[PDB]
Enzyme design. Sequence first.
Site, mmCIF file in Angstrom:
data_model
loop_
_atom_site.group_PDB
_atom_site.id
_atom_site.type_symbol
_atom_site.label_atom_id
_atom_site.label_comp_id
_atom_site.label_asym_id
_atom_site.label_seq_id
_atom_site.Cartn_x
_atom_site.Cartn_y
_atom_site.Cartn_z
ATOM 1 N N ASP A 196 0.729 -1.271 0.000
ATOM 2 C CA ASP A 196 0.000 0.000 0.000
ATOM 3 C C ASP A 196 0.759 1.323 0.000
ATOM 4 O OD1 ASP A 196 -1.856 2.157 0.449
ATOM 5 O OD2 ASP A 196 -3.150 0.848 1.559
ATOM 6 N N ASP A 201 -2.129 5.955 -5.396
ATOM 7 C CA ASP A 201 -2.248 4.943 -4.359
ATOM 8 C C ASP A 201 -2.397 3.540 -4.916
ATOM 9 O OD1 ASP A 201 -3.084 4.314 -1.373
ATOM 10 O OD2 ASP A 201 -5.146 4.577 -2.020
HETATM 11 C C1 LIG Z 1 -13.149 -2.864 -0.397
HETATM 12 C C2 LIG Z 1 -11.780 -2.153 -0.442
HETATM 13 C C3 LIG Z 1 -11.115 -3.472 0.037
HETATM 14 C C4 LIG Z 1 -10.472 -3.486 1.213
HETATM 15 C C5 LIG Z 1 -9.926 -4.626 1.628
HETATM 16 C C6 LIG Z 1 -10.023 -5.750 0.880
HETATM 17 C C7 LIG Z 1 -10.705 -5.736 -0.267
HETATM 18 C C8 LIG Z 1 -11.236 -4.592 -0.692
HETATM 19 N N1 LIG Z 1 -11.336 -1.759 -1.805
HETATM 20 C C9 LIG Z 1 -11.889 -2.283 -3.056
HETATM 21 C C10 LIG Z 1 -12.904 -1.305 -3.624
HETATM 22 O O1 LIG Z 1 -13.294 -0.388 -2.935
HETATM 23 N N2 LIG Z 1 -13.415 -1.533 -4.878
HETATM 24 C C11 LIG Z 1 -14.486 -0.694 -5.415
HETATM 25 C C12 LIG Z 1 -12.910 -2.632 -5.690
HETATM 26 C C13 LIG Z 1 -10.321 -0.879 -1.938
HETATM 27 O O2 LIG Z 1 -9.970 -0.551 -3.062
HETATM 28 C C14 LIG Z 1 -9.640 -0.351 -0.670
HETATM 29 C C15 LIG Z 1 -9.189 1.089 -0.859
HETATM 30 C C16 LIG Z 1 -10.409 1.931 -1.083
HETATM 31 C C17 LIG Z 1 -10.003 3.302 -1.630
HETATM 32 C C18 LIG Z 1 -9.744 4.314 -0.842
HETATM 33 S S1 LIG Z 1 -9.527 5.806 -1.781
HETATM 34 C C19 LIG Z 1 -9.856 4.814 -3.178
HETATM 35 N N3 LIG Z 1 -9.822 5.319 -4.376
HETATM 36 N N4 LIG Z 1 -10.084 3.598 -2.927
HETATM 37 C C20 LIG Z 1 -8.650 1.470 0.492
HETATM 38 O O3 LIG Z 1 -9.458 1.676 1.379
HETATM 39 N N5 LIG Z 1 -7.269 1.460 0.664
HETATM 40 C C21 LIG Z 1 -6.597 1.738 1.941
HETATM 41 C C22 LIG Z 1 -5.796 0.471 2.357
HETATM 42 C C23 LIG Z 1 -6.546 -0.838 1.983
HETATM 43 C C24 LIG Z 1 -5.546 -1.876 1.366
HETATM 44 C C25 LIG Z 1 -6.209 -3.264 1.195
HETATM 45 C C26 LIG Z 1 -6.731 -3.725 2.580
HETATM 46 C C27 LIG Z 1 -7.817 -2.749 3.102
HETATM 47 C C28 LIG Z 1 -7.167 -1.367 3.310
HETATM 48 C C29 LIG Z 1 -5.576 2.909 1.738
HETATM 49 O O4 LIG Z 1 -4.827 2.747 0.496
HETATM 50 C C30 LIG Z 1 -6.372 4.219 1.793
HETATM 51 C C31 LIG Z 1 -5.721 5.432 1.067
HETATM 52 C C32 LIG Z 1 -6.183 6.660 1.938
HETATM 53 C C33 LIG Z 1 -5.138 7.811 1.865
HETATM 54 C C34 LIG Z 1 -7.608 7.154 1.493
HETATM 55 N N6 LIG Z 1 -6.316 6.073 3.245
HETATM 56 C C35 LIG Z 1 -6.398 6.829 4.462
HETATM 57 C C36 LIG Z 1 -6.439 4.725 3.202
HETATM 58 O O5 LIG Z 1 -6.588 3.971 4.243
#
Ligand SMILES: C[C@@H](c1ccccc1)N(CC(=O)N(C)C)C(=O)C[C@@H](Cc1csc(N)n1)C(=O)N[C@@H](CC1CCCCC1)[C@@H](O)[C@@H]1CC(C)(C)N(C)C1=O
EC number: 3.4.23.15
Lengths: 334, 333
Positions: free
Chosen positions: B35, B219
């Site tokens: 990440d 990201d």
């Molecule tokens: C459901 C979530 C997920 C999580 C876990 C397992 C499977 C799926 N998903 C898939 C998703 O939303 N679609 C639509 C496929 C993400 O992409 C997760 C992504 C959502 C996102 C945020 S902004 C954006 N455009 N998309 C995110 O939260 N990503 C987190 C870390 C995740 C890594 C995988 C495990 C769950 C946590 C940080 O990258 C984000 C980035 C930031 C700066 C917003 N922040 C504070 C975060 O925590």
Amino acid sequence: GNTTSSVILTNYMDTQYYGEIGIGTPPQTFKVVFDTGSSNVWVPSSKCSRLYTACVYHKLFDASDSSSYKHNGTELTLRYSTGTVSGFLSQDIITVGGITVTQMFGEVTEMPALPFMLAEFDGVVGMGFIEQAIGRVTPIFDNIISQGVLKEDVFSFYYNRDSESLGGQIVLGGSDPQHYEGNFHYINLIKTGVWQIQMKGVSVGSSTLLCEDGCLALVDTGASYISGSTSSIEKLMEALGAKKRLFDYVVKCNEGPTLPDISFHLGGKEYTLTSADYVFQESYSSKKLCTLAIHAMDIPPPTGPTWALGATFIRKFYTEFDRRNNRIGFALAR
Amino acid sequence: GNTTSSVILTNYMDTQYYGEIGIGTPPQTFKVVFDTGSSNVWVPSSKCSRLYTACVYHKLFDASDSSSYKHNGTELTLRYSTGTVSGFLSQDIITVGGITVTQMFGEVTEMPALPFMLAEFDGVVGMGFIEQAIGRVTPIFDNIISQGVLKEDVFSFYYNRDSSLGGQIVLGGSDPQHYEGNFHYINLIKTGVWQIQMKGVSVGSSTLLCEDGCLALVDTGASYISGSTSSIEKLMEALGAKKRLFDYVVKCNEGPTLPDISFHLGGKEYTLTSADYVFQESYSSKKLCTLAIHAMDIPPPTGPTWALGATFIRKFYTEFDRRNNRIGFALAR
Ligand SMILES: C[C@@H](c1ccccc1)N(CC(=O)N(C)C)C(=O)C[C@@H](Cc1csc(N)n1)C(=O)N[C@@H](CC1CCCCC1)[C@@H](O)[C@@H]1CC(C)(C)N(C)C1=O
Ligand SMILES: C[C@@H](c1ccccc1)N(CC(=O)N(C)C)C(=O)C[C@@H](Cc1csc(N)n1)C(=O)N[C@@H](CC1CCCCC1)[C@@H](O)[C@@H]1CC(C)(C)N(C)C1=O
């Protein structure tokens, strides 16, 4: 000496990886398979019955077009675990990526449809010792070594994964620091003559659910899959949820990406394959089934019974076939 | 140094890309997500409670299993945009590519179905700067750098379109097999975070969004490109996408019909076509295809920001430049 050579390999479906060799002058080019479970060469013959569809469907060697050829003539039978092939022996020059050897090989005049018809390659190049050669014919490499060209007395396997890539590659003489990472782990064979290595166990899950109290692992390039004895696989599969069918093992597609890790407790290391390594996800549907990449095979003594680490595992780990010091080394690949 | 270590990556549905890592002695293997949006490493504790169906189906860290394992027990809550996870800090050795390093990994013990169940992998490896770190524990890369083994203090990212090879991470530089031409960098607005600034979102010919500066998090552990509810709202209108019960869909048949979307980054434009935004399961007039863009409101300080995810990374090979604190892009292949 100082020679290093490659042989570029074509990955055809993660199941077949063939190179190219030339026999006779002018060269007659052939798609062959490099096989560490055998010590012989053979390539379809002109003399082959056209009633052998495989013989209609591949490239045949025609000796009458080879000024470099010496009639030998002895019948030989090459029986492999998936099929037999009878023929007879000739000799001519073989060109193996760089190296020219006067090879003693065989003119297959009985090529069966099953499996050969499904074969993308014409013949095979055995890369096992003379202690296995049918007819006791001095093997291709055994000849390159008697040549003093090789920088080093090893050959290494790189098996790429498909592309919709660089398929794979052998290196005679050296190794390729652009195919692996880290450093090798050396396992040294039981007897010499066979590429075998003791296996301290098999863990589907975490628990050594198999091979506890050891067993053996044959290292083979001519094997599309990983094989384990019948009961051995019965159990593995059991653990794994897999549907046993006729030729392969299956799993609800969707089910695939969560199948557990399987590990080979090899020479002290644990060599794990994750399910992305042993699962042919051509989909994630609950409806479609999916082909694992592991399958039984009872290998009879003397070599058997053994586990056979084929294409499946060489794809995840670069393999160094080391003749000098008599051992095999693996590295993680790139 | 002069090493370089790729980590082959799996791609579960063009939405999840995860590699393997091994913790402890002997190494123990988990499937993680690297990440750039986070800066903590965490994987399930064996100390994780069975009632969590999640831990139930996920690889677990039996510390008893690692000789090298070292106790810390300092409690840790990690709170992501789609979920909060929580356990305590541990300390072992980590394997990443042929690289091996002692780390401050978290050992998860409270981990929810939503989202946790979605996940095909087991944990996370945050490639974030220290700055954005819970427990102010040095990030993984942060150590490795110091190990002084890698040729360049950079890591590349190749996300693959799914149909094989689904991706690969280069710790130490770039794999020229996976990019076309040269990179065009984009300086970090400021250290701590991985975020550059965008000068405008275009719909075909015209900028519509981002007329006078905006932010863009590049990201790696976010699937889709995201904007503020209010910009994305504008965005789906120029397209003529429709929110459908959840996210925005299209009539597949009309995929080919849509205007290129353009990300103005550091003077040059990073241009994505339909091909690259829609998930054309088909070309049916009878089917609705979904787009790979989401409305996602990020909180201050880090927000409001746009966020380039895997959607964009699929197209543009990404180069994370620790040294220069810049981000470079190039056409993946
Ligand atoms: C459901 C979530 C997920 C999580 C876990 C397992 C499977 C799926 N998903 C898939 C998703 O939303 N679609 C639509 C496929 C993400 O992409 C997760 C992504 C959502 C996102 C945020 S902004 C954006 N455009 N998309 C995110 O939260 N990503 C987190 C870390 C995740 C890594 C995988 C495990 C769950 C946590 C940080 O990258 C984000 C980035 C930031 C700066 C917003 N922040 C504070 C975060 O925590
Ligand atoms: C069926 C066969 C095949 C079919 C069509 C075309 C090509 C090959 N296949 C593909 C296959 O198994 N699947 C599942 C598609 C092999 O891998 C063949 C493999 C089967 C096997 C045995 S143990 C194992 N893990 N797999 C084998 O026999 N491999 C032979 C050499 C083959 C090279 C390609 C041409 C046919 C001969 C020796 O390696 C084996 C190994 C050994 C030494 C135990 N022994 C005695 C042998 O005969």
